[PDB]
Amino acid sequence: MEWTAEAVIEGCAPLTPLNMTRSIAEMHMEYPPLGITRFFKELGYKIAKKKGTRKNRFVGQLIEPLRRVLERHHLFGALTSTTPRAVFNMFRSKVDRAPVELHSHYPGLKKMYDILADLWLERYGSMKRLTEEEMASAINRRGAMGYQMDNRNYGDLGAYWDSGDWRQDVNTFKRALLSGTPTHAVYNTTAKRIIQYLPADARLYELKVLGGLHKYLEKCGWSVAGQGLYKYGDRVKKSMDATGAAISEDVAGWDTKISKGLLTLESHMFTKLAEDEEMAREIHHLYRLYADPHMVVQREIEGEVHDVLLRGRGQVSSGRQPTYAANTITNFITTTYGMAVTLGIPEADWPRLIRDLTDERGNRRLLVSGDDKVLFLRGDEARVYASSAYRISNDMGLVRKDMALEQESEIIVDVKEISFCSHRYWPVKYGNEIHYMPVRDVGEIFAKATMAMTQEAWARVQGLNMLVNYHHIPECRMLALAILSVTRIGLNLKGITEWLRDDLAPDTIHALITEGRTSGWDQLGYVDFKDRKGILLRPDTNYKNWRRDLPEKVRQLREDGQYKDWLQKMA
Ligand SMILES: [Mg+2]
């Protein structure tokens, strides 16, 4: 289907497509396009090789006795590689869908982007490019290199980073981008959902230029940027206490629905924040890339596997480091706008509104992380919001997941029923105080801890993370202590913070949750026995047998390293 016209947004620099001839030629397409997509425009294809699931040996073997109940009563879910046929079918089903570019809400959205940018600049100043030390802290060392870099034989981002060759490469990327004819600008893809990512040099560049957005979010009361999961429940509780009603709605396929119009506003805002005029040019040129995404996706026809070069318009790619910060900001702005219009908040009050949301003052609160949000309102405003705010997000194509288009919002009045960041939050006692701590299906928890000496270091970090965040769930505390008992001391955990250490102890956990008002293993709380069902493991004979055999399993899994016994910190 032909693309609609684009939105023309007053006061914003248009995101003109770059000259992509150089980056297209880098993909070495062989054949003219077949054209079987409805939105993406196929430019060509080439014959490929079928592209690709492995469980961590340490975590996997420790939970092996529970695999059956976790697969039968929970959401563990396992694993075969996705076929090219299945990859293209999922692309067509979920990604090959035109964003809604044309609607009447850009002028008011722009006003709020401008308000937020002005508040950040007034309070915190402009945004510098990341330093090398800052980039080293944020890179995923296991990330892929990308087809355009595969012939340099680095293996992964970590090895590429360590080599130091990226320093010249990112400046080569910068110069070509600013010229209007970029190199290495075509997205690679892999299935896990389709992940889209630029080559490693491009990714280090975009991290350097846009990585500072997280620093502003750390200052915002509506963001959880930089904060650990163990803090989120208390923030949900605090926000609810100030309001009394919550609306928690997910958008189906958020990344696929973001329009070039919204990207135009993102770029507008971020260029406002830049330290110097060259930085603003760099940001604007990156968004000229983002808004005109070219990507290679696999398919299979008559037994022949193709690498297909496709061109879209708008949308958001997942394997882009700024995506989290940009999604969070755009989610905050679109949600605040729809709420303010629906509740009739006058536009002259919008600067105060955005300040109060940022300062957690007043009778309206937001919590936002990427495409996930909870809106908190008094009951009276919640009813007004629930009755019609969906019309504005529908206008923008931000259709809500799993409900009818014009279904009124569900108004949540119990803090324990609010889903945020894929968890709910339950009250847990630490000594004589209560903190709200995260729960979700334990099959999901265990699966994420299993599906990736790097392997041992990775497992050990999963155990440290599980102990800090899920010690209130007994099976999670047990698995964590077992992980820490089977993984050796002295590994490089930082390559995989406050608690990321071999000598982790309760005092560190109490410092994070109660600021050290409590102490000891005995004041780390548990959920009530009566609630150990449903999303949590029922404590039946299967569970008690696993617990009985864990000490032996730990001893059998240990090898040549130095280990410490952690299971004695519990039953
Ligand atoms: Mg939510």
Side-chain angles (χ1 to χ4, degrees), residues 27-42:
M27 308 315 296
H28 311 133
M29 294 286 120
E30 304 160 348
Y31 303 100
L34 292 184
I36 69 188
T37 40
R38 69 179 71 81
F39 169 60
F40 277 88
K41 291 169 167 0
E42 186 176 333

Side-chain angles (χ1 to χ4, degrees), residues 248 250 372-374 419:
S248 191
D250 286 337
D372 195 323
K373 47 144 157 43
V374 183
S419 307

Side-chain angles (χ1 to χ4, degrees), residues 308-319 322-354 356-360 362-400 402-447 449-452 454-465:
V308 189
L309 180 56
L310 295 153
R311 181 200 180 193
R313 186 179 69 180
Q315 300 188 312
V316 176
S317 298
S318 58
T323 285
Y324 175 83
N327 276 339
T328 300
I329 294 169
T330 290
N331 196 2
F332 170 79
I333 293 287
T334 54
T335 301
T336 302
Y337 168 79
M339 169 203 78
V341 172
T342 300
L343 300 177
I345 303 174
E347 295 185 13
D349 293 337
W350 289 8
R352 207 161 11 251
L353 170 66
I354 281 167
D356 283 349
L357 289 166
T358 301
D359 294 341
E360 296 172 78
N363 321 306
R364 314 179 179 106
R365 308 287 164 88
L366 272 163
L367 287 168
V368 187
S369 176
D371 66 2
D372 195 323
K373 47 144 157 43
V374 183
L375 172 62
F376 302 83
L377 296 167
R378 276 185 197 163
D380 48 11
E381 286 199 331
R383 291 179 71 88
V384 175
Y385 180 94
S387 297
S388 90
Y390 63 77
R391 284 193 236 281
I392 289 170
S393 45
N394 284 352
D395 283 348
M396 298 184 277
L398 300 177
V399 165
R400 297 167 297 166
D402 294 339
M403 53 207 312
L405 211 51
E406 299 203 297
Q407 189 183 132
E408 286 185 338
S409 296
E410 178 179 47
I411 298 182
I412 306 165
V413 302
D414 177 0
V415 56
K416 302 180 298 294
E417 295 290 325
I418 302 165
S419 307
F420 183 59
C421 288
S422 303
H423 295 80
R424 300 202 158 161
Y425 304 89
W426 294 354
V428 173
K429 310 251 325 105
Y430 293 84
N432 56 53
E433 36 187 294
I434 297 170
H435 294 274
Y436 281 75
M437 291 295 285
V439 295
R440 77 190 292 193
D441 180 86
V442 293
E444 292 185 319
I445 292 165
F446 285 9
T450 307
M451 299 327 231
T454 304
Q455 183 171 189
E456 197 175 357
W458 190 86
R460 194 166 174 78
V461 166
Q462 295 298 322
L464 295 162
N465 185 86

Side-chain angles (χ1 to χ4, degrees), residues 525-537 539-541 543:
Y526 285 115
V527 311
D528 283 343
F529 188 88
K530 71 174 208 63
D531 294 314
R532 294 181 58 189
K533 58 187 181 42
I535 51 163
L536 305 193
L537 207 64
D540 57 26
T541 46
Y543 158 79

Side-chain angles (χ1 to χ4, degrees), residues 137-167 169-191 194-319 322-354 356-360 362-400 402-428:
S137 274
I139 57 165
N140 172 9
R141 303 183 52 91
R142 305 281 92 71
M145 296 291 312
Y147 170 84
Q148 306 93 311
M149 296 285 273
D150 274 336
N151 79 335
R152 314 253 301 258
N153 290 283
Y154 285 108
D156 62 27
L157 184 40
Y160 177 50
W161 178 258
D162 293 343
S163 87
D165 298 336
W166 56 274
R167 299 198 182 87
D169 294 348
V170 306
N171 208 266
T172 299
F173 184 91
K174 177 176 157 162
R175 277 185 263 110
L177 176 66
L178 294 177
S179 80
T181 305
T183 181
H184 291 188
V186 168
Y187 284 89
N188 292 260
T189 64
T190 185
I194 301 150
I195 300 119
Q196 293 155 246
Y197 61 96
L198 292 178
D201 50 349
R203 300 210 304 282
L204 287 175
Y205 176 75
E206 65 191 342
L207 164 68
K208 177 202 204 188
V209 178
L210 287 168
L213 289 173
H214 213 75
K215 289 193 202 162
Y216 291 111
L217 290 180
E218 297 185 330
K219 308 292 203 186
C220 298
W222 44 268
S223 176
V224 292
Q227 269 213 330
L229 181 64
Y230 46 84
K231 309 302 289 163
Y232 293 8
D234 284 346
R235 297 270 296 277
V236 173
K237 178 61 157 51
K238 169 177 175 200
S239 293
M240 194 66 164
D241 284 342
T243 50
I247 292 150
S248 191
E249 299 174 318
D250 286 337
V251 171
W254 166 276
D255 284 355
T256 72
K257 289 160 167 56
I258 300 305
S259 65
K260 175 173 181 178
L262 286 183
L263 297 186
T264 301
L265 291 175
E266 289 185 358
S267 193
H268 174 66
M269 188 207 186
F270 302 163
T271 61
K272 270 186 150 31
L273 297 169
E275 193 164 50
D276 49 66
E277 289 178 283
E278 184 184 42
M279 189 172 175
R281 270 193 74 230
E282 293 180 80
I283 294 170
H284 174 77
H285 280 72
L286 276 171
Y287 265 82
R288 292 178 61 188
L289 193 164
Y290 298 153
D292 181 40
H294 295 55
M295 70 197 49
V296 173
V297 186
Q298 292 213 316
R299 88 184 149 206
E300 177 261 304
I301 295 162
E302 293 167 29
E304 192 174 71
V305 181
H306 300 168
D307 269 340
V308 189
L309 180 56
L310 295 153
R311 181 200 180 193
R313 186 179 69 180
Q315 300 188 312
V316 176
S317 298
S318 58
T323 285
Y324 175 83
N327 276 339
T328 300
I329 294 169
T330 290
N331 196 2
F332 170 79
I333 293 287
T334 54
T335 301
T336 302
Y337 168 79
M339 169 203 78
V341 172
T342 300
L343 300 177
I345 303 174
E347 295 185 13
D349 293 337
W350 289 8
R352 207 161 11 251
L353 170 66
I354 281 167
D356 283 349
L357 289 166
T358 301
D359 294 341
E360 296 172 78
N363 321 306
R364 314 179 179 106
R365 308 287 164 88
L366 272 163
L367 287 168
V368 187
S369 176
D371 66 2
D372 195 323
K373 47 144 157 43
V374 183
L375 172 62
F376 302 83
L377 296 167
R378 276 185 197 163
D380 48 11
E381 286 199 331
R383 291 179 71 88
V384 175
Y385 180 94
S387 297
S388 90
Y390 63 77
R391 284 193 236 281
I392 289 170
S393 45
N394 284 352
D395 283 348
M396 298 184 277
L398 300 177
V399 165
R400 297 167 297 166
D402 294 339
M403 53 207 312
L405 211 51
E406 299 203 297
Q407 189 183 132
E408 286 185 338
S409 296
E410 178 179 47
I411 298 182
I412 306 165
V413 302
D414 177 0
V415 56
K416 302 180 298 294
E417 295 290 325
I418 302 165
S419 307
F420 183 59
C421 288
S422 303
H423 295 80
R424 300 202 158 161
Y425 304 89
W426 294 354
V428 173

